[PDB]
């Protein structure tokens, strides 16, 4: 479309030339929360519909956690054409995160590095914000537009499991699914929650708390993992997920690795790397996790998705749904309709009746 080319070639590069990435982020959230958007003309066709996690998803393209950390722009994100929205990560108490600057653009790599450090309005603020639109969300969900909430841990928390449990109790009743984020590269000690004994204990507590919620307010629980795990780590996660009956996996968060070939001047900043250099690392992690769980655990695939081809590669690797974030920062709102339109065309070209038929297709070749 003309909007796609206009955003990608004119509007977005101009905004990027004028604003540091954090200011750009804050502006994006503001414009989105106000519905000031090109408003996609793409009608979701039936072949993009997916049923998973106890819900219908009108299309399989979601906005990844971190864009709307505090639940301020949920409705504008659906207007942008996302099939589902994940907010967060949200921590129990409000916290400021790391000192600025803490977000860095690598335009030559179509990548971002961030070290926000879980800046969060906290559970109470987000709870009230979601309560104010709770019935509007119930309608959206019923119409195939579910809401996910991603939970984090405070920097000074003395008991990680109790932080997550508090999030389940407070935001679980407002969410279609919850994500236990044990994969931020930007909170000391967080990723070691991915180890076997620690993960089993943590997830047992989260699931107990979830199961204690009333039936209509009981969300699916997913675990979001890093792309930097050892083979042993991945095996252990797969085993725990199956033992406890975890509902799904989100694969993957940002990477602390710095792949050979990064060109951006800021490539050596501390933080998680997202965008194109993460893409195939994430796809391969999806492929491994799908195999280790025998295709029985739904996976949301995320990392470097910017086109229908990228989305379909993750779906064929084993993802039931995909998310993007970094691509929005480069291409702007029209990227959402672009991914959906290209995905539909490719499904047709590859002889799939719909997204559902393509899930895990590479493992059946
Ligand atoms: C600026 C920024 C902030 C993020 N914040 C969070 C977060 O709070 N919680 C989370 O689980 N993931 C967070 N992520 C990770 C994204 O959800 C996603 O896993 C990752 O960026 C890979 O997708 P992408 O390549 O499409 O950006 C963040 C990513 C970025 C770039
Ligand atoms: C009508 O025009 C619109 C409407 C709605 C949204 C945008 C829009 C603008 C932007 F500057 C960005 N960029 C970022 O958020 N950068 C970053 C986010 N997190 C780390 S860096 C965006 F993603 C979207 C433009
Ligand atoms: O807040 C952050 O720093 C953050 C959290 C997360 O889960 N992933 C990420 O890349 N950054």
ω into 89 cis (within 30 of 0): yes
The CA R_g of the chain, rounded to the nearest whole Å, is: 19
Is residue 88 marked as binding? no
Give the whole-angstrom CA distance, residue 247 versus residue 227. Answer: 20
HSE (side-chain half, CA atoms, 13 Å) at 57: 29
6: which 2 tokens?
Answer: 């206009």
DSSP 180-199: EE---TTSTTSGGGGSHHHH
Question: What is the experimental resolution, given in Å to one decimal place?
Answer: 1.9
Q: Which atom of ligand 1 is nearest to 64's Cα?
A: 17
Cα–Cα distance measured from residue 213 to residue 207, given in angstroms and rounded to the nearest whole number: 10
Query: Which technique was the structure solved with, according to the deposited record?
Result: X-ray
> What single string gives the DSSP state of each residue in 321-348?
EEEESHHHHHH-THHHHHHHHHHHHHHH
Q: Which ligand is nearest to the CA of 330?
A: 2
CA-based nearest residue to 220, from 229, 211, 228: 211
Residue 126 is inside which H or E element, if any? Answer: helix 123-131
Choosing from 62, 65, 117, 228 the residue with most ligand 1 atoms within 8 A of its CB, the one to mutate for a pocket test is: 65
CATH, domain 1-365, list 3.20.20.70, 3.40.50.300, 1.10.275.10, 1.20.1250.20: 3.20.20.70
List 157, 184, 274, 282, catalytic entry = 184
Measured in angstroms, how far is the CA atom of residue 324 from the centroid of ligand 2? 13
Using the 8-state DSSP alphabet, how is residue 238 labeled? H
3-state helix, strand, coil in the chain (%, to 5): 45, 15, 35
H or E, element range at 5: helix 2-6
| CA dist list (Å): 132 to 87, 126, 136 | 15, 10, 9
Of 165, 159, 166, the C-alpha closest to 189 is 159
Q: Cα–Cα distances in Å, from 350 out to 318, 354, 355?
A: 16, 10, 11
Instruction: Give residue limits of the domains in the chain.
Output: 1-365
Identify whether the C-beta of residue 89 lies closer than 8 Å to the C-beta of residue 184. yes
CA-CA distance, 329 to 351, in Å (whole number)?
32
Those residues with Cβ within 8 angstroms of residue 137's Cβ, 6 or more apart along the chain or in another chain: 74, 130, 147, 174
- Cα dihedral sign, 345-350-353-358: negative
């Amino acid at each position: 479309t003309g909007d796609e080319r206009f955003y990608a070639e004119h509007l977005m590069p101009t905004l990027q030339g004028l604003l540091d990435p954090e200011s750009a982020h804050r502006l994006a959230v503001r414009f989105t929360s106000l519905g000031l958007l090109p408003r996609a003309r793409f009608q979701d066709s039936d072949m993009l519909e997916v049923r998973v996690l106890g819900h219908k998803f009108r299309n399989p393209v979601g906005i990844a956690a971190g864009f709307d950390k505090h639940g301020e722009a949920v409705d504008g994100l659906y207007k942008m054409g996302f099939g589902f929205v994940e907010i967060g990560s949200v921590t129990p108490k409000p916290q400021e995160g790391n000192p600025r600057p803490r977000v860095f653009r690598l335009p030559e790599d179509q990548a971002v590095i961030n070290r926000y450090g879980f800046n969060s309005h906290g559970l109470s603020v987000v709870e009230h914000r979601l309560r104010a639109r709770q019935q509007k969300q119930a309608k959206l969900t019923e119409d195939g537009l579910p809401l996910g909430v991603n939970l984090g841990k405070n920097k000074t928390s003395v008991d990680a499991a109790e932080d997550y449990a508090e999030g389940v109790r407070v935001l679980g009743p407002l969410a279609d699914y919850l994500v236990v984020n044990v994969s931020s590269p930007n909170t000391a000690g967080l990723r070691s929650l991915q180890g076997k004994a620690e993960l089993r204990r943590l997830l047992t507590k989260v699931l107990q708390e979830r199961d204690g919620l009333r039936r209509v307010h009981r969300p699916a629980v997913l675990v979001k993992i890093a792309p930097d795990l050892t083979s042993q780590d991945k095996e252990d996660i797969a085993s725990v997920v199956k033992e406890l009956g975890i509902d799904g996996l989100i694969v993957t968060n940002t990477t602390v690795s710095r792949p050979a070939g990064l060109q951006g001047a800021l490539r050596s900043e501390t933080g998680g790397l997202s965008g194109k250099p993460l893409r195939d690392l994430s796809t391969q992690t999806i492929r491994e996790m799908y195999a280790l769980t025998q295709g029985r655990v739904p996976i949301i695939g995320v990392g470097g998705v910017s086109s229908g081809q990228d989305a379909l590669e993750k779906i064929r690797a084993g993802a039931s749904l995909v998310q993007l974030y970094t691509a929005l920062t480069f291409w702007g709102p029209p990227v959402v309709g672009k991914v959906k339109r290209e995905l539909e065309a490719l499904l047709k070209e590859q002889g799939f009746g719909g997204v559902t038929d393509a899930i895990g297709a590479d493992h059946r070749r």
